[PDB]
Write an enzyme that holds these catalytic residues in place. Structure first.
Site, PDB file in Angstrom:
ATOM      1  N   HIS A 108       0.896  -1.146   0.000  1.00  0.00           N
ATOM      2  CA  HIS A 108       0.000   0.000   0.000  1.00  0.00           C
ATOM      3  C   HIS A 108       0.940   1.201   0.000  1.00  0.00           C
ATOM      4  O   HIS A 108       1.314   1.712   1.055  1.00  0.00           O
ATOM      5  CB  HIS A 108      -0.856  -0.035   1.262  1.00  0.00           C
ATOM      6  CG  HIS A 108      -1.511  -1.359   1.490  1.00  0.00           C
ATOM      7  ND1 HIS A 108      -1.333  -2.093   2.644  1.00  0.00           N
ATOM      8  CD2 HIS A 108      -2.322  -2.101   0.696  1.00  0.00           C
ATOM      9  CE1 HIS A 108      -2.005  -3.225   2.552  1.00  0.00           C
ATOM     10  NE2 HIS A 108      -2.613  -3.255   1.378  1.00  0.00           N
ATOM     11  N   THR A 109       1.327   1.620  -1.204  1.00  0.00           N
ATOM     12  CA  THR A 109       2.260   2.718  -1.399  1.00  0.00           C
ATOM     13  C   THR A 109       1.862   4.000  -0.686  1.00  0.00           C
ATOM     14  O   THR A 109       2.723   4.790  -0.301  1.00  0.00           O
ATOM     15  CB  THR A 109       2.468   3.014  -2.911  1.00  0.00           C
ATOM     16  OG1 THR A 109       1.222   3.396  -3.506  1.00  0.00           O
ATOM     17  CG2 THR A 109       3.006   1.784  -3.629  1.00  0.00           C
ATOM     18  N   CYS A 110       0.564   4.206  -0.497  1.00  0.00           N
ATOM     19  CA  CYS A 110       0.112   5.407   0.183  1.00  0.00           C
ATOM     20  C   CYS A 110       0.570   5.391   1.631  1.00  0.00           C
ATOM     21  O   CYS A 110       0.731   6.441   2.261  1.00  0.00           O
ATOM     22  CB  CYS A 110      -1.411   5.523   0.140  1.00  0.00           C
ATOM     23  SG  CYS A 110      -2.009   7.052   0.912  1.00  0.00           S
ATOM     24  N   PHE A 111       0.784   4.190   2.158  1.00  0.00           N
ATOM     25  CA  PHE A 111       1.209   4.053   3.537  1.00  0.00           C
ATOM     26  C   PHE A 111       2.629   3.521   3.684  1.00  0.00           C
ATOM     27  O   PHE A 111       3.064   3.221   4.795  1.00  0.00           O
ATOM     28  CB  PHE A 111       0.222   3.163   4.297  1.00  0.00           C
ATOM     29  CG  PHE A 111      -1.195   3.671   4.260  1.00  0.00           C
ATOM     30  CD1 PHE A 111      -2.006   3.429   3.155  1.00  0.00           C
ATOM     31  CD2 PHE A 111      -1.701   4.436   5.308  1.00  0.00           C
ATOM     32  CE1 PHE A 111      -3.304   3.946   3.092  1.00  0.00           C
ATOM     33  CE2 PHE A 111      -3.001   4.959   5.256  1.00  0.00           C
ATOM     34  CZ  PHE A 111      -3.801   4.714   4.146  1.00  0.00           C
ATOM     35  N   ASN A 112       3.352   3.416   2.569  1.00  0.00           N
ATOM     36  CA  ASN A 112       4.729   2.926   2.604  1.00  0.00           C
ATOM     37  C   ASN A 112       4.732   1.608   3.385  1.00  0.00           C
ATOM     38  O   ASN A 112       5.635   1.331   4.176  1.00  0.00           O
ATOM     39  CB  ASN A 112       5.617   3.962   3.305  1.00  0.00           C
ATOM     40  CG  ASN A 112       5.651   5.301   2.566  1.00  0.00           C
ATOM     41  OD1 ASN A 112       5.812   6.360   3.171  1.00  0.00           O
ATOM     42  ND2 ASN A 112       5.514   5.248   1.261  1.00  0.00           N
TER      43      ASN A 112
END
Length: 374
Positions: A345-349
């Site tokens: 989840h790239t938005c949350f690294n």
């Protein structure tokens, strides 16, 4: 990820064979750089940018070396990319890579400028020059004509993504009803409607179509308010470097070709990683770090984009990673079982790392996810 070195040499050779004789001169002042670069480049033919480049800052300095080319691409890269010009804006805030600003329409010639930026980024690539660009992986997907996935959405609009996810793996109800193949849009005083397809405002969304709906809603979310700008950018880029020359690259490789490969500080990375249902003493975490220590820097970089959505690290190292909530350090969370594949989840690294049974299995599973992601 794999034959990247070959694809790169192939691109270099392609540019060399297409190099044009004679040269182009670029006279710009250190503080009128953007405007004059625009005027001179747009007055030249797009293929003129394939000739040798002579950038002479008339801050009328040094004598010679493509160090000025490198500086130019660097400088102008920050000017064009600077949101102070209203062409681009910032993502999840107070962070950093960038997005085409829907309100660029304020400037009635924004399309001329987007064409310019496209020519300029293709020029940087043609000459193997790196730029501090902040384009997202999905934007790169668009450049390569690769269809956007629902995962791509997750990194742009978590709210929109959550609603489409529900609509997908779930049958319409106790939360769902009538939705049509149209979107009743934003910025303008009209209260109007946009069809996702022919006669879409009349096509009801059902438990059979909904898949196309999802597809169409995803693409619309990415290009909403920026279709013209995007097209203008791609057309400009295409006149200098045919988009077809990039067909063998995936979006993660494209990003690296523009910003350049960088070394990853493993100690900085490790001391600034946070965990969920895992600890530094979890064998899975001990294996994860042994794995990062053993692989190539290219694998490390691909892993960073898999998890954070980019290969670039902010100034200050890992301790400074940002999310759309402020601080968002690299996070590893345990999920599912050892039969699952890792996810992110790239938005949350965040990296979802299943509790594998052995190092070899962890290694094998991570690598597959890192390279084979598409």
């Amino acid at each position: 990820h794999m034959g990247f070195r070959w694809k790169l040499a192939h691109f270099r050779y392609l540019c060399q064979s297409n190099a044009l004789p004679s040269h182009v001169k670029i006279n710009v002042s250190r503080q009128t750089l953007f405007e004059d670069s625009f005027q001179q480049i747009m007055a030249l033919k797009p293929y003129d940018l394939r000739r040798r480049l002579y950038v002479i800052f008339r801050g009328e300095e040094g004598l010679d070396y493509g160090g000025l080319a490198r500086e130019w691409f660097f400088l102008l890269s920050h000017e064009v990319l600077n949101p102070m010009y209203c062409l681009f804006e910032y993502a999840g805030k107070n962070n950093y890579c960038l997005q085409i600003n829907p309100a660029s329409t304020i400037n009635p010639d924004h399309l001329s400028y987007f064409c310019f930026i496209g020519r300029f980024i293709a020029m940087a690539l043609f000459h193997g020059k790196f730029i501090d660009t902040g384009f997202s992986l999905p934007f790169y997907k668009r450049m390569l004509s690769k269809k956007l996935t629902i995962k791509d959405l997750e990194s742009i609009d978590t709210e929109f993504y959550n609603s489409l996810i529900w609509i997908r793996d779930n049958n319409i109800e106790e939360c769902g009803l009538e939705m049509y193949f149209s979107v009743d849009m934003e910025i303008l005083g009209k209260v109007t409607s946009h069809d996702l397809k022919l006669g879409g405002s009349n096509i009801l969304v059902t438990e059979e179509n909904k898949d196309e709906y999802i597809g169409l809603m995803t693409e619309w979310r990415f290009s909403r308010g920026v279709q013209e700008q995007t097209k203008a950018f791609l057309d400009g880029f295409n006149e200098v470097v045919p988009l077809q020359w990039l067909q063998y690259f995936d979006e993660k490789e494209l990003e690296v070709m523009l910003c350049g490969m960088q070394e990853v500080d493993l100690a900085d990375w490790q001391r600034n990683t946070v965990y969920r249902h895992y600890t530094r003493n979890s064998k899975q975490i001990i294996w994860f770090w042994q794995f990062v220590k053993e692989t190539d820097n290219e694998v490390r970089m691909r892993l960073l984009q898999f998890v954070t959505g980019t290969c670039r690290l902010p100034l200050g190292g890992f301790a400074e990673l940002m999310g759309s909530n402020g601080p968002q350090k690299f996070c590893i969370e345990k999920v599912g079982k050892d039969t699952w594949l890792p996810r992110s989840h790239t938005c949350f690294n965040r990296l979802d790392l299943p509790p594998y049974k052995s190092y070899e299995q962890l290694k094998e599973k991570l690598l597959f996810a890192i390279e084979e992601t598409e």
